[PDB]
Design a protein around this ligand. Structure first.
Ligand SMILES: CC(=O)SCCNC(=O)CCNC(=O)[C@H](O)C(C)(C)COP(=O)(O)OP(=O)(O)OC[C@H]1O[C@@H](n2cnc3c(N)ncnc32)[C@H](O)[C@@H]1OP(=O)(O)O
Ligand SMILES: CC(=O)SCCNC(=O)CCNC(=O)[C@H](O)C(C)(C)COP(=O)(O)OP(=O)(O)OC[C@H]1O[C@@H](n2cnc3c(N)ncnc32)[C@H](O)[C@@H]1OP(=O)(O)O
Lengths: 318, 317
């Protein structure tokens, strides 16, 4: 019984809702541009909460919903790139917050691929027979990294968190995976640069997020379609939950990929780019709508891509 | 499908800073610093960041091992002083050495990051899906510190070290115990980035801060218990703990009842390098011949700190 499975999903986003119209009133941008370019119509931006609070809520919900108590959690992995501190890790904040005294935790830094990466990591942990229960949460608060005057990026990212309760099963669910990265293009998407100002530093080396639009666009369409076809073919997949960066991107991938577009579930119109939280939000939401149903054995693939560059897919049966 | 450390390597900035140079900057003395931590000097970057330090460690693991970057299946960097939120130091290192065939990411577990990260690699290899990887612990606290607060400025140093890990026919990672206590996360914290967006209304310090006695008392009590979970004086040959304070290692060796000469020390030359402390000590011990790969010595690696996090790994070198 070393086979992991997702057995409970949950999401949480700031109550605050910001539409493209409220943004067009802040920068030289419009609802028609933003939307026709990404499919994004609104986003949720924190006003008080940070990444740890958002994740805290997801964890809380997983337990309430699953009837599982914190003492049962063996571990906690948070995939974030907008953590509260360098230390502690959001995972540790969350651990102490829900009183999961028996679990150990840490965050994983893999940008917009953080959830797929983190999730895979958990499967390895459970498969080891060492651990059976854990929480994999993807949470982000980009609002605090963005330059709200650079319309280039300010209109894309949103705040949010979502995760799943993962436990060992007797039957295998995580069929196959392919995690990839290309650090020779790391410059394409970057944020959080902390400069050294110690009295010893003598080098002459921007804390806000900055990215190369085309670079990542072109990259995703190519490198991702390849990574997805590695695992499946339209004929061998039921649904695909990709990073919700741009609908135009998903549209181009579905085409190159030769996979029925109806399988690529979309969410960005309501949350925008939440990076590592995009996929789990979409997943919980799909479960809720009934599109996906745990136990149904539906062949689903989860694929993320972004900062790193990083990207990877997971073929699993829900 | 059994992992085994097969090559170690370290790298620290050339810039050596002694307790005397610091006593000159703050109200502190070499006498105080040393007698409370055993630290005599640190390594402080002058033009290097975490990625640069880790890059060398990786570079060297390949040289030493004769492996080609194309052979690396993955890269895990345990850091808490990364260059950027994104990319991850791991990704920068990946592109830096041209390890096109590996995927990578950083793990955020403070001073336990190496033991945590290392364990992680174990599972990856055990999964049979990956058989080669680099686990590096790197840090550059000098940029996080408030060099006027003698409370913390005298403890941390910069540095990086790691190991080349590959699958073997025989098991090496015998047993492990990873723990955390997020209810005392406040004890040691750094890098708080404040939200300054036009929407944020909340009214919630970028530099490192920590509660001395909290962590001291915590380490001595909780770590000793953790270590005894895996071994006893007779079932262990060497122990490589986080190199925070020698006085801490002393108190632990006592309560633990394990021969003190089994706890290898290193802080005198590097200070607290957090996630890099253990691998630097390990590469140093291997170089010195105290430890010898293949020898099959009972070794336990234990880290503790920010989180709170802590955990040990019982493995045979
Ligand atoms: C991995 C992630 O998580 S995000 C994925 C990457 N996603 C994206 O591509 C972001 C969303 N999409 C876009 O930016 C477009 O579809 C892109 C990528 C084709 C633009 O690429 P580029 O070749 O560099 O720009 P393009 O030639 O199409 O022109 C874009 C124009 O829009 C402007 N622009 C940028 N943001 C906005 C905005 N919010 N509102 C109005 N105009 C904007 C540009 O400054 C530029 O104006 P110009 O025509 O006067 O130079
Ligand atoms: C997990 C890790 O990575 S770190 C592990 C934790 N490490 C350690 O505990 C650090 C080493 N230990 C210590 O400094 C002490 O022995 C401890 C454990 C008793 C805790 O220290 P503190 O709680 O800060 O106060 P302590 O009881 O030692 O008092 C010493 C006094 O000297 C000051 N002080 C601190 N550093 C120095 C220094 N380098 N030179 C002179 N005075 C100093 C203190 O702030 C205090 O005086 P003040 O209260 O008037 O400012």
């Amino acid at each position: 019984k070393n086979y992991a499975r997702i057995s409970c999903t949950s999401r949480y986003v700031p109550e605050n809702c910001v539409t493209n119209h409220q943004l067009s009133e802040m920068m030289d941008t419009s609802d028609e541009w933003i939307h026709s370019r990404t499919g994004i119509s609104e986003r949720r931006i924190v006003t008080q909460e940070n990444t740890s609070d958002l994740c805290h809520q997801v964890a809380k919900q997983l337990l309430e919903k699953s009837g599982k108590q914190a003492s049962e959690i063996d571990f906690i992995l948070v995939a974030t790139v907008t953590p509260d501190f360098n230390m502690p890790s959001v995972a540790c904040q969350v651990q102490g917050a829900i009183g999961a005294t028996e679990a150990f935790a840490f965050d994983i830094s893999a940008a917009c691929s953080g959830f797929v990466y983190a999730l895979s990591m958990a499967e390895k942990l459970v498969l080891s027979g060492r651990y059976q229960t854990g929480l994999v949460i993807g949470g982000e608060t980009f609002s605090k990294m963005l330059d709200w005057t650079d319309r280039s990026t300010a209109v894309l990212f949103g705040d949010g968190a979502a995760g799943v309760l993962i436990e060992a099963a007797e039957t295998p669910h995580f069929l196959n995976e392919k995690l990839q990265a290309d650090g020779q293009r790391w410059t394409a998407l970057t944020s959080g640069y902390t400069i050294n100002e110690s009295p010893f530093y003598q080098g002459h080396k921007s804390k806000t997020l900055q990215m190369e639009g085309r670079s990542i666009f072109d990259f995703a369409i190519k490198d991702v379609s390849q990574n997805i076809l590695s695992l499946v073919t339209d004929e061998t997949v039921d649904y695909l939950l990709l990073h919700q960066a741009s609908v135009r991107i998903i549209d181009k991938i579905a085409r190159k990929t030769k996979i029925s577009r109806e399988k690529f579930l979309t969410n960005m119109d309501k949350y925008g780019n939440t990076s590592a939280a995009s996929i789990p939000i979409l997943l919980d939401e799909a479960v809720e709508n009934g599109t996906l149903i745990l136990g149904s054995q539906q062949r689903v693939v989860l694929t993320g891509f972004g900062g790193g560059l990083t990207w990877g897919s997971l073929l699993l049966t829900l």
